[PDB]
Amino acid sequence: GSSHHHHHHGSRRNIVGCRIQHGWKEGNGPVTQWKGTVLDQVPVNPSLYLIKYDGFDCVYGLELNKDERVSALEVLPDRVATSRISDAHLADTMIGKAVEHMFETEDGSKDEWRGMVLARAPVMNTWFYITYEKDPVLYMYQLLDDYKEGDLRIMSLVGKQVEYAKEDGSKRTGMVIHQVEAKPSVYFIKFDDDFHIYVYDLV
């Protein structure tokens, strides 16, 4: 948590790399329970953390210490293994590449999604950041497993505001929070009132 020290000052633990668990208050709904791994703290907005929850494919951005929907936030002593990946070479060249990522439907039929591998994830470094042309939010998977099974085939504005023209005719405002290193025209965007991380080529 943020610990008052007091009037103009607050202290907080460095929680990047830590396992956490907390409740989440769905708006006018029940409390849901969550556990995951803190991957990063965003430089342009240091109260925003990027989180990977166990069993949930999207990477989320939450202001863990300030968002009032978060309750009973617990930072665990658990130590996340720093694994030395199966093949650093194969991982590192996969970065910045367009890919065809095979999923399968309930129907058992094939469903092939065009994507882009963006980076190796921080902290959980055998996992990769990836986004999709038809679903431009940030996802995270152990893509070396997909690759070896043959289910994966290989082919600054940070700080600025963005406005997105919603289909309604509404306008969604957000902030550019990260520049992809392997591809500096591609950025992560956090929209207010949405906890997904959007990924767009801003050129």
Binding site: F103, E104, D146, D151
Partner: peptide
């Protein structure tokens, strides 16, 4: 192959 998840919100 992986299956696509339903996700909240």
């Amino acid at each position: 192959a992986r299956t696509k998840q339903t996700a909240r919100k």
